[PDB]
Design an enzyme around this catalytic site. Structure first.
Site, short mmCIF file in Angstrom:
data_model
loop_
_atom_site.label_atom_id
_atom_site.label_comp_id
_atom_site.label_asym_id
_atom_site.label_seq_id
_atom_site.Cartn_x
_atom_site.Cartn_y
_atom_site.Cartn_z
N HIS A 83 -8.71 3.69 5.84
CA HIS A 83 -7.82 4.82 6.11
C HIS A 83 -7.26 5.31 4.79
CE1 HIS A 83 -4.74 1.56 6.15
NE2 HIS A 83 -3.85 2.50 5.88
N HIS A 85 -4.52 5.94 3.15
CA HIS A 85 -3.19 5.67 2.64
C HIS A 85 -3.26 5.24 1.18
CE1 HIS A 85 -0.57 4.96 6.50
NE2 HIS A 85 -0.70 6.25 6.19
N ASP A 87 -2.36 2.70 -0.52
CA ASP A 87 -2.73 1.34 -0.91
C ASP A 87 -4.19 1.01 -0.61
OD1 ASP A 87 -1.79 1.56 1.76
OD2 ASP A 87 -1.36 -0.62 1.96
N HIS A 88 -4.97 1.97 -0.14
CA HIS A 88 -6.39 1.78 0.16
C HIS A 88 -7.27 2.85 -0.45
CE1 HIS A 88 -4.91 -1.38 2.59
NE2 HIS A 88 -4.16 -0.56 3.32
N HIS A 159 -3.53 3.36 13.39
CA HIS A 159 -2.76 3.17 12.17
C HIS A 159 -2.69 4.48 11.40
CE1 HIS A 159 -0.97 0.96 8.86
NE2 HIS A 159 -1.70 1.75 8.09
N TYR A 190 6.51 2.29 13.45
CA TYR A 190 6.11 3.58 14.03
C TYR A 190 6.87 3.80 15.33
CZ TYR A 190 1.79 3.91 11.16
OH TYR A 190 0.86 4.02 10.14
N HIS A 224 -6.12 -5.36 4.23
CA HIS A 224 -5.23 -6.42 3.79
C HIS A 224 -5.86 -7.75 4.19
CE1 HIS A 224 -2.00 -3.73 2.59
NE2 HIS A 224 -2.35 -3.01 3.64
C1 5A5 Z 1 6.49 -7.23 9.45
C2 5A5 Z 1 6.46 -6.03 8.50
C3 5A5 Z 1 7.07 -6.36 7.12
C4 5A5 Z 1 5.04 -5.49 8.35
C5 5A5 Z 1 3.90 -6.26 8.58
C6 5A5 Z 1 2.63 -5.70 8.42
C7 5A5 Z 1 2.49 -4.37 8.01
C8 5A5 Z 1 1.11 -3.70 7.82
C9 5A5 Z 1 0.93 -3.00 6.47
S1 5A5 Z 1 1.99 -2.98 5.13
C10 5A5 Z 1 1.00 -2.03 4.10
N1 5A5 Z 1 1.29 -1.59 2.75
N2 5A5 Z 1 -0.10 -1.73 4.76
C11 5A5 Z 1 -0.18 -2.24 6.01
C12 5A5 Z 1 -1.43 -1.94 6.82
O1 5A5 Z 1 -1.51 -2.32 8.03
O2 5A5 Z 1 -2.38 -1.32 6.24
C13 5A5 Z 1 3.63 -3.64 7.78
C14 5A5 Z 1 4.90 -4.18 7.93
ZN ZN Z 2 -1.64 2.13 6.00
ZN ZN Z 3 -2.06 -0.91 3.98
#
Ligand code: 5A5
Ligand code: ZN
Ligand code: ZN
Length: 267
Positions: A83, A85, A87-88, A159, A190, A224
Site C-alpha cells: 500500500h 503509505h 513507510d512502504h 488498511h 481508524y 511489517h
Molecule cells: C497498537 C498500536 C500502537 C498499533 C499497532 C499496529 C499498527 C499497524 C501499523 S503502524 C505503521 N507505521 N504501519 C502499520 C501497518 O499496519 O502498516 C498500528 C498501531
Molecule cells: Zn499503512
Molecule cells: Zn505501515
C-alpha cells in the site's frame, strides 16, 4: 531567517530503521530492507523486481543492497507495492529517478502515490512523502511476468483502499515455494463505522480477511515483519515462527472485531 531545509525538526529514534544485509528468502527472493521494514528483491534473468521500499530515507541503503546482489541501477525493472503509505512507498520516487525501475499499481494505490500520501482517508496530510507516478495500472487478478517469474495481484482493500497482496512461485531446495506478500490488515485508530470517507470499510475488511486466508501460501511475508512473526535480524532463523496466511488473517480479524466492539459501546 533560516533556510527551508532547516525549518523542520523530524522525530528520529536511533532504534528505528536498522539496516541489514540481504537475507535470502528463496532462490531468487531476498529481504533487502531494514530489520523493521520489508523490501523484497526478486532477481530474474530479465531484470529485478522490488516489492516495497520502506521509508523515504531508505533509498540509498536499498541501492547498496541491490549492488551487493549484483543488481545495478539499470537492472531494476519493476516496483510493486503493498500500500502507498510513507513507510512502504517512501523511496519510490527517488528510486525511479536513480534507476530504470517502473511502477505497477492498482488505481487506488496509484492515485494515493501520485499525491504523495496526502489527503489520506484517516490521517489527513500528516503522512506525506515524495509523490510518484505509476507506469502501469493493474486490475484485480492481473499477472505480471518478469523473466519467467509470475506475480499475481490480489486486492485486499481496508488498511488503504488500494491495499494489495502479491503472490509468486519461487524455488527453494528444488521444490517450488509459493510466496505470498500480504499487505497490512490493521485499522489503527481508524473510525470503522459511519466513516464518511470510507462507507464500506467494514465490508471491505471482512472480504480481505477471507482473501488473505485463501491465498496460495507456502511462505507468508508482510510489510511489517512483526505482523507475520518474522524476525529479520535472526539470520537463518528469521522465518522459524512465521504465521500462516490463515493465522495472520484470523489474528487480524479478532483484533478488528475487538476494536469494533469498543467503538460501538455506549459511553
Ligand atoms: C497498537 C498500536 C500502537 C498499533 C499497532 C499496529 C499498527 C499497524 C501499523 S503502524 C505503521 N507505521 N504501519 C502499520 C501497518 O499496519 O502498516 C498500528 C498501531
Ligand atoms: Zn499503512
Ligand atoms: Zn505501515
Amino acid at each position: 531567517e533560516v533556510p527551508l531545509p532547516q525549518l523542520r525538526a523530524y522525530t528520529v529514534d536511533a532504534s528505528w530503521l536498522q539496516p541489514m544485509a540481504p537475507l535470502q528468502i528463496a532462490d531468487h527472493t531476498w529481504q533487502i530492507g531494514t530489520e523493521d521494514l520489508t523490501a523484497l528483491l526478486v532477481q530474474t534473468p530479465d531484470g529485478a523486481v522490488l516489492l516495497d521500499g520502506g521509508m523515504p530515507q531508505m533509498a540509498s541503503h536499498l541501492l547498496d543492497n541491490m549492488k551487493a546482489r549484483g543488481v545495478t541501477p539499470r537492472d531494476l525493472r519493476l516496483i510493486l507495492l503493498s500500500h502507498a503509505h510513507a513507510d512502504h512507498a517512501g523511496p519510490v520516487a527517488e528510486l525511479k529517478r536513480r534507476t530504470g525501475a517502473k511502477v505497477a499499481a492498482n488505481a487506488e494505490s496509484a492515485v494515493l502515490l501520485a499525491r504523495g500520501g496526502s489527503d489520506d482517508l484517516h490521517f489527513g496530510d500528516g503522512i506525506t512523502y515524495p509523490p510518484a507516478n505509476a507506469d502501469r495500472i493493474v486490475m484485480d487478478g492481473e499477472v505480471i511476468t518478469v523473466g519467467g517469474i509470475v506475480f499475481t495481484a490480489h486486492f485486499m482493500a481496508g488498511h488503504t483502499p488500494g491495499s494489495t497482496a502479491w503472490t509468486w512461485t519461487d524455488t527453494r531446495n528444488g521444490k517450488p515455494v509459493r510466496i505470498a506478500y500480504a499487505d497490512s490488515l490493521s485499522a489503527p485508530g481508524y473510525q470503522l463505522q459511519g466513516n464518511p470517507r470510507y462507507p464500506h470499510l467494514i465490508e471491505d475488511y471482512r472480504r480481505s480477511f477471507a482473501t488473505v486466508r485463501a491465498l496460495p501460501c507456502d511462505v507468508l511475508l508482510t510489510p511489517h515483519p512483526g505482523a507475520s512473526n518474522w524476525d529479520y535480524a535472526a539470520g537463518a532463523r528469521a522465518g522459524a515462527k512465521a504465521l500462516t496466511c490463515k493465522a495472520y488473517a484470523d489474528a487480524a480479524e479478532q483484533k478488528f472485531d475487538g476494536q469494533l466492539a469498543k467503538e460501538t459501546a455506549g459511553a
